[PDB]
């Protein structure tokens, strides 16, 4: 049928530009044949298909490739990601809803929907009458909406009794103070 | 490979036959932009970013031309081994919490796409939708397959039910992923 070629570059940053690693993958259909890994220092053949390339590239393009760690990776991070990606702050919306139709003294589940936030770092906690809940809290993975915002659902297994106050507590870099939402039976 | 951030400056994919190519920049897993090979422009997902940073599309075109070049060479090298078709798997979920009458967006996340050719469409009450639909470029996966997301703006109601239709060469028939509010 068809044939595919993929070229996938990766600039891995740690502690800002304190540690930058550059990995470049050359792939045929779904087989990576030759890879440049700055931790290694030169191109390498992953499979036989890469020998015709590794050999030659280490002679004519080694230094040019290594320099991209500064000319591309570091440059982009400091001059373009800095004023955009790294400055993006989107506050989470938090709302609680009950899974099953209410009936006091009957087991149920509270759902805290924390949505539309960026970046991914976030802390979501459940409290019942001022005490933090742990064992009965469950969560989805961090969901990437694909539009530069995430969402996550944190559930609390509970039994609504009169006078109780259930609080979903969210902490995020875009927030000076935590966002809390209460639900009373 | 762990790190605080990851920038993929210049993911370049080319496919034959058909002369299908894609050039994108991803940061921390999100799409910074893709270069429209035909219009020859850099299309930013977040339009505001194009005000603080810029990319010359030529770099995109050039990298694609090279992708094309390396495809012939590699196709010959494998003795014309064709790409295996995979079965894409779709998942539908709402962007925001579902509330009768409150505008929302349904998201169709399609994973394990290979090769990078697909049709992702929406059906509302079993009929095709045109308006309110947007789609991302293909995102790379650790196993070299791709994922893509489609978006449908909608208002949750009692009568409307939905389907994300996925049509791919690795699927005998278009698959429907059903979703309806509560």
């Amino acid at each position: 049928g068809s044939f595919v070629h993929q070229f996938q570059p990766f600039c891995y940053f740690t502690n800002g530009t304190q540690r930058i690693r550059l990995v470049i993958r050359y792939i045929y259909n779904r087989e990576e044949y030759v890879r440049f890994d700055s931790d290694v220092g030169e191109y390498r053949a992953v499979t036989e298909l890469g020998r015709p390339d590794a050999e030659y590239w280490n002679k004519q393009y080694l230094e040019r490739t290594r320099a991209e760690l500064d000319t591309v990776c570091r440059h982009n991070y400091e001059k373009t990601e800095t004023p955009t990606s790294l400055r993006r702050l989107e506050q989470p919306s938090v709302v609680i809803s009950l899974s099953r139709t209410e009936a006091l003294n009957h087991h149920n589940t509270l759902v805290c929907s924390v949505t539309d936030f960026y970046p991914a770092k976030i802390k979501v906690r459940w409290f019942r009458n001022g005490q933090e809940e742990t064992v009965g809290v469950s969560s989805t993975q961090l969901i990437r909406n694909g539009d530069w915002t995430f969402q996550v659902l944190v559930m609390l297994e509970m039994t609504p009794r009169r006078g109780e106050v259930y609080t979903c507590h969210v902490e995020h870099p875009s927030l000076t103070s935590p966002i809390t939402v209460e639900w009373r039976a | 490979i762990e790190a605080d951030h990851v920038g993929s400056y210049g993911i370049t994919v080319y496919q034959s036959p058909g002369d299908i190519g894609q050039y994108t920049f991803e940061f921390d897993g999100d799409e910074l932009f893709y270069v429209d090979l035909d219009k020859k422009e850099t299309v930013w997902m977040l339009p505001e970013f194009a005000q603080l940073r810029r990319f010359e599309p030529q770099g995109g075109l050039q990298n694609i031309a090279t992708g094309k070049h390396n495809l012939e060479i590699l196709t010959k090298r494998s003795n014309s081994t064709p790409a295996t078709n995979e079965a894409p798997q779709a998942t539908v979920f709402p962007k925001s919490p579902v509330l009768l009458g409150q505008p929302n967006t349904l998201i169709c996340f399609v994973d394990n796409i290979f090769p990078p050719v697909i049709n992702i469409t929406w059906l509302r009450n079993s009929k095709s939708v045109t308006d309110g639909v947007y789609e991302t470029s293909f995102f790379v996966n650790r196993d070299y397959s791709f994922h893509k997301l489609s978006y449908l703006t909608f208002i949750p109601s009692d009568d409307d039910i939905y389907d994300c239709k996925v049509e791919h060469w690795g699927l005998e028939e278009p698959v429907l992923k059903h979703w309806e509010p509560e």
Binding site: D53, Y56, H75, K79 | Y9, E56, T66
Partner: peptide, 13 residues
């Protein structure tokens, strides 16, 4: 500022 892309190298015919 301007973004720079990582260069893809052309294999030999």
């Amino acid at each position: 500022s301007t973004d720079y892309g990582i260069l893809q190298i052309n294999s030999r015919w």
